[PDB]
Write a protein that binds this ligand. Structure first.
Ligand SMILES: Nc1ncnc2c1ncn2[C@@H]1O[C@H](COP(=O)(O)OP(=O)(O)OP(=O)(O)O)[C@@H](O)[C@H]1O
Ligand SMILES: [Mg+2]
Length: 272
């Protein structure tokens, strides 16, 4: 069964030798499964997003750091000042909400288009992001012949990565409300929303429009070390105590235990 630590260098060894179908192979490799000790991916063919939750120091930030490292491996740099990508390569652009500033250097400025650490910064950044996403569709009222001619928007894959979403205001106040309309058609606008939240008060966190939209889109939910007392999370599954880095990867009614690939974060600040 699963080890207490499995490095990202280790999962990459496995990913380069994995040709399994229907698991998102060739994509972001961020964990290994309890079932077969094989890689677990962000299967963008199934879903564009990911939610991660768990109690204090379960490994939420490290999970994002591993995913970001994978983005750097699999994608050409897609920030505005980055060079044109090598032929055949997809491009990735990161929009980072990181209040505790732990993920600022997981990727260089050739990947990170915008990052925000204060509320005003988040509000401003989300406005810019929404404007870019709104442009990713054809002009209205074109003929069939016109629509056939080309792809009408161009640009890199956009990763909206948010650590510690619990620190943001909930409700309609939420700065993330401008990105909500794109969640359901994320694949068509090349959007990926990856968010973490502390497990405390999880069932009462539906009040966040982004978390609600992600649940409505049936995004994968990794429930790391957690408390059964919060009740059922998805279907008949409750959260439970787990070693650090380990989580129950939930769909709607089913789940599988995984061990998240570890990577270094110089930056870890827990406010002890
Ligand atoms: N995948 C992992 N495998 C093994 N250990 C891990 C893993 N992820 C995190 N840890 C360990 O757990 C500790 C906390 O890491 P991290 O800061 O990522 O957690 P966190 O949940 O974000 O914490 P916080 O609650 O402060 O946000 C660190 O010591 C880290 O080494
Ligand atoms: Mg953290």
């Amino acid at each position: 069964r699963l080890p207490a630590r499995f490095g990202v260098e280790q999962v990459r060894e496995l990913a380069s030798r994995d040709t399994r179908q229907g698991v998102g192979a060739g994509g972001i490799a961020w964990a290994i499964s309890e079932l077969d000790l094989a890689p677990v991916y962000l299967n963008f063919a199934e879903n564009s997003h990911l939610m991660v939750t768990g109690r204090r120091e379960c490994g939420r930030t490290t999970t994002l750091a591993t995913i970001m490292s994978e983005i750097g491996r699999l994608y050409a740099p897609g920030a505005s000042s980055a060079p044109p990508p090598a032929p055949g390569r997809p491009s990735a652009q990161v929009w980072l909400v990181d209040p505790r500033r732990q993920l600022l250097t997981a990727l260089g400025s050739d990947y990170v288009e915008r990052f925000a650490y204060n509320l005003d910064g988040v509000v401003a950044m989300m406005g810019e992001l929404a404007a870019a996403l709104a442009g990713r569709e054809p002009p209205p009222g074109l003929s069939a012949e016109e629509l056939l001619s080309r792809s009408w928007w161009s640009g890199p894959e956009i990763f909206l990565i948010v650590d510690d979403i619990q620190q943001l205001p909930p409700g309609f106040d939420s700065p993330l409300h401008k990105a909500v309309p794109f969640v359901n058609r994320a694949a068509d606008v090349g959007l990926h929303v990856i968010v973490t939240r502390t497990f405390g008060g999880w069932s009462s966190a539906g009040s966040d429009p982004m978390l609600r939209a992600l649940h409505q889109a049936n995004a994968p939910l990794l429930v790391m070390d957690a408390d059964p007392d919060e009740g059922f999370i998805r279907g008949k599954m409750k959260g439970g105590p787990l070693p650090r880095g380990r989580g129950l990867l939930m769909a709607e009614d089913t789940g599988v235990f995984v061990q998240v690939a570890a990577t270094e974060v110089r930056r870890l600040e827990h406010h002890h």
